[PDB]
Amino acid sequence: SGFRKMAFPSGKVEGCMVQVTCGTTTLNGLWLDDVVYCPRHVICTSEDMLNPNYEDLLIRKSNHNFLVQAGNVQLRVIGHSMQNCVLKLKVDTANPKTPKYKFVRIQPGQTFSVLACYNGSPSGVYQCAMRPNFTIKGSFLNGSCGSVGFNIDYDCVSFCYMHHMELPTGVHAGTDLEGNFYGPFVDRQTAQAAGTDTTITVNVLAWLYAAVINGDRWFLNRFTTTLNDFNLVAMKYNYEPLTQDHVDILGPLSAQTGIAVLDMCASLKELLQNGMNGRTILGSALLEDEFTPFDVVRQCSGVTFQ
Amino acid sequence: SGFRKMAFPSGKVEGCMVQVTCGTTTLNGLWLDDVVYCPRHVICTSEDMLNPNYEDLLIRKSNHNFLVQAGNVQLRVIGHSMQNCVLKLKVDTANPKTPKYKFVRIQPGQTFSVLACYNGSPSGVYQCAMRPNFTIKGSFLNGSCGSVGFNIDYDCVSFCYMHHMELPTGVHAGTDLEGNFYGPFVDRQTAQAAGTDTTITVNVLAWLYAAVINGDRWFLNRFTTTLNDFNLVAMKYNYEPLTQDHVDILGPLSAQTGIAVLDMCASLKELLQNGMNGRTILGSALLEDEFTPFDVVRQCSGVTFQ
Numbered sequence: 001s002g003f004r005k006m007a008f009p010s011g012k013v014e015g016c017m018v019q020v021t022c023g024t025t026t027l028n029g030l031w032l033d034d035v036v037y038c039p040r041h042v043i044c045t046s047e048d049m050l051n052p053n054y055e056d057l058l059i060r061k062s063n064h065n066f067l068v069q070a071g072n073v074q075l076r077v078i079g080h081s082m083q084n085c086v087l088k089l090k091v092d093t094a095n096p097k098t099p100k101y102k103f104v105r106i107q108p109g110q111t112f113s114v115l116a117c118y119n120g121s122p123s124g125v126y127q128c129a130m131r132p133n134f135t136i137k138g139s140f141l142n143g144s145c146g147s148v149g150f151n152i153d154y155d156c157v158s159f160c161y162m163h164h165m166e167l168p169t170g171v172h173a174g175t176d177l178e179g180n181f182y183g184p185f186v187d188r189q190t191a192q193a194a195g196t197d198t199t200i201t202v203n204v205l206a207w208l209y210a211a212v213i214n215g216d217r218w219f220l221n222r223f224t225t226t227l228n229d230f231n232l233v234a235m236k237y238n239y240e241p242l243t244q245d246h247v248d249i250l251g252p253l254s255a256q257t258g259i260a261v262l263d264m265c266a267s268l269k270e271l272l273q274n275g276m277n278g279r280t281i282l283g284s285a286l287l288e289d290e291f292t293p294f295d296v297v298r299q300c301s302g303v304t305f306q
Numbered sequence: 307s308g309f310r311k312m313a314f315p316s317g318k319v320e321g322c323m324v325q326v327t328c329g330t331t332t333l334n335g336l337w338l339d340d341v342v343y344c345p346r347h348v349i350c351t352s353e354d355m356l357n358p359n360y361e362d363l364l365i366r367k368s369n370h371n372f373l374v375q376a377g378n379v380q381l382r383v384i385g386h387s388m389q390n391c392v393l394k395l396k397v398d399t400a401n402p403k404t405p406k407y408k409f410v411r412i413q414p415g416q417t418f419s420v421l422a423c424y425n426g427s428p429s430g431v432y433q434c435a436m437r438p439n440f441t442i443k444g445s446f447l448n449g450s451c452g453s454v455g456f457n458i459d460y461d462c463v464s465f466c467y468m469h470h471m472e473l474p475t476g477v478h479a480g481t482d483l484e485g486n487f488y489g490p491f492v493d494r495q496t497a498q499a500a501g502t503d504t505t506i507t508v509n510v511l512a513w514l515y516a517a518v519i520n521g522d523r524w525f526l527n528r529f530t531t532t533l534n535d536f537n538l539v540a541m542k543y544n545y546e547p548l549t550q551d552h553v554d555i556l557g558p559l560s561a562q563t564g565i566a567v568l569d570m571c572a573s574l575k576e577l578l579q580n581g582m583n584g585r586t587i588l589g590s591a592l593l594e595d596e597f598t599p600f601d602v603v604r605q606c607s608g609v610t611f612q
């Protein structure tokens with residue numbers, strides 16, 4: 001028992017992190033096979049950081065302008081190209097630590113692990129969710145550009161996020177590993193901002209089920225509600241609508257706890273309308289929305305990876 | 307910016323995890339050089355699990371009774387011995403992935419990373435603190451015995467915890483890597499229970515400083531307090547006393563924020579006496595006590611490891 005924000009073991013990703021330097025900009029790159037992936041903003045100078053034409057900036061570069069270091073061993077760049085907002089550097093050495101991997105793009109509401117890095121050296125690992133507004137509430141300092149987010153399934157690493165920048169509210173924006181931004185953000189200097197967010201309803205319900213599995217029951221009740229009536233309440237409190245597919249996805253947790261999904265919706269309705277009245281759920285005084293139904297099932301049931 | 311529960315990168319520990327089977331009990335072991343460390347309870351059967359004499363149980367064992375598997379490769383046990391509550395199995399192969407390491411014992415109030423494992427395969431990583439009552443609020447299912455907790459300093463892994471058992475409130479107890487239990491717990495079947503806990507005051511103050519660094523200031527005030535007057539309030543709310551050494555340890559964070567330590571104590575006094583009145587600090591509606599001053603400085607300033 002217990003319930004923690006749990007990241008995937010990071011070893012398979014640690015062996016891919018390298019340092020990329022170009023001019024006076026140093027950031028992180030991801031070394032898979034004989035390609036290093038990094039944010040294209042590495043080719044930018046401070047004056048360039050206003051409205052850059054990256055195609056012009058890149059044609060002016062030579063392979064030898066890119067200094068790539070894997071630990072204390074230098075990698076020879078032998079080609080370079082741009083894909084959307086990422087750069088692809090061919091090096092003369094395939095990474096012998098390349099795991100089996102995929103490049104996947106995730107949905108708002110999904111979670112992933114982040115390996116924060118600086119100067120190509122991993123610093124820490126933590127769990128994040130992609131917000132409905134396509135930002136993530138990360139923990140990043142300068143030099144963390146190019147740190148990646150990922151999930152692991154058996155032995156295969158699905159990379160889903162590369163970090164690019166911090167927005168004015170302190171939240172973070174980046175791309176998938178094809179270089180396409182999550183949300184309406186750009187890698188140039190603008191007044192861009194997060195814009196309005198919502199709470200991930202199906203994840204809150206999953207977490208209430210985690211709580212019942214772990215012995216917190218004070219918020220349960222005899223009442224039930226209809227899906228339409230719950231969704232009218234979700235809308236008032238800025239929760240996102242609950243669909244029949246969400247209900248279906250919650251079936252296994254409902255069957256394990258014996259609590260009908262619509263019954264747990266009635267409990268959530270009461271919690272939004274009454275607050276918590278000084279009590280806690282799984283050590284939190286707030287309704288937590290950064291655990292998916294899958295996250296709850298891995299942690300309360302117990303699957304590993306190799 | 308941002309502030310997350312952040313674990314150390316787990317790769318160096320993943321390469322040490324193995325599976326140990328004896329009879330019908332399977333759990334995790336830690337393989338360093340040519341020794342595998344695991345809980346001595348592995349030699350116990352269900353009837354033995356009432357008041358076992360482990361010295362008798364162990365003399366009845368042969369090396370060949372211990373099946374040790376590193377991935378899908380079997381390790382030959384060539385010796386065995388008991389140290390306090392851990393078992394030490396000599397194998398015929400030194401682990402080529404052995405990091406530089408130390409066995410350290412930590413203090414209540416300190417934090418560490420936990421690599422949860424099952425069948426010798428790492429499952430997830432998360433951050434924990436050692437509670438004042440010598441338990442930890444972990445996330446563990448059956449088969450997680452022998453999972454370890456650790457910190458990393460530059461390239462050196464300081465192992466501080468091996469997991470043994472779950473107590474009736476759902477919290478967890480284990481040993482240091484010398485096999486000495488944290489707190490008044492034993493590896494036999496009793497009615498043992500956690501017993502009363504307190505809140506780690508210096509860690510709460512560190513986290514308030516993290517919040518100010520990250521832009522949360524609503525809880526600040528002009529007031530100050532004396533150390534004795536704060537400690538009278540800490541005692542009412544079951545917080546642990548604040549010492550002059552705690553004040554000294556908070557000096558760097560105080561100097562960075564310009565907020566005197568005793569001023570931040572006056573803020574904490576107000577928060578205990580008034581609650582939070584519907585607001586949050588670093589995304590929490592509770593006063594968080596599982597970040598040390600060191601944790602705040604690594605994350606709000608930014609050190610890595612190799």
Ligand SMILES: *[C@@H](O)c1cccc2[nH]ccc12
Nearest residue numbers: 039041145146163164187
């Ligand atoms: C580094 O990830 C990056 C990418 C885009 C824009 C930007 N500005 C400062 C760093 C940075």
Ligand SMILES: *[C@@H](O)c1cccc2[nH]ccc12
Nearest residue numbers: 345347451452469470493
């Ligand atoms: C496995 O860590 C362990 C250690 C002591 C007592 C005990 N009971 C069930 C598992 C276990």
